[PDB]
Nucleic acid binder design. Structure first.
Ligand SMILES: [Zn+2]
Ligand SMILES: [Zn+2]
Ligand SMILES: [Zn+2]
Ligand SMILES: [Zn+2]
Lengths: 73, 73
DNA sequence: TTAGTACGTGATGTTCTA
DNA sequence: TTAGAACATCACGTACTA
């Protein structure tokens, strides 16, 4: 509440169905749309925060879905 | 050997003191020269390979120093 | 309200030139 | 033989509009 559910950054309102920051809002749109497989370099449980969220699109995307984000309304 | 000591890609020669590919040669030069204080999102033990080496510069650089690479000061 | 655009920035990996 | 620069490409995050 005022904090992004994906990465803990300061949130700017709900986006695609969950409370997120602006960077996570645009990341989810880019990564949900694409037909990309993302690979985690560790164990699929990376810590996603303001400074680490860049490292692992796979875990960040997983967390977006887990927080309920969706492109299909 | 023909194998990059950092990421397992095909090596290109001895670079900065260790057998590495071309991408790891330029990465190490940029990483050692700049102090980006790279952060790992996991446990400082990421898998570094051709498909994952972009995920965790911090662990990739860790591997470079463990492999003996150095800028000669 | 929040989704879309488009920019500016920076990391990456190779080809080139020493 | 390898160091280093440059260019193209791409991921990222922001400001701005509606
Ligand atoms: Zn976020
Ligand atoms: Zn991960
Ligand atoms: Zn390598
Ligand atoms: Zn790591």
């Amino acid at each position: 509440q005022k904090t992004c559910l994906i990465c803990g950054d300061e949130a700017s309102g709900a986006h695609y169905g969950a409370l997120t920051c602006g960077s996570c809002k645009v990341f989810f749109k880019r990564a949900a749309e694409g037909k990309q497989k993302y690979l985690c370099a560790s164990r699929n449980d990376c810590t996603i925060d303001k400074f680490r969220r860049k490292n692992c699109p796979s875990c960040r995307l997983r967390k977006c879905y887990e927080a309920g984000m969706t492109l299909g309304a």
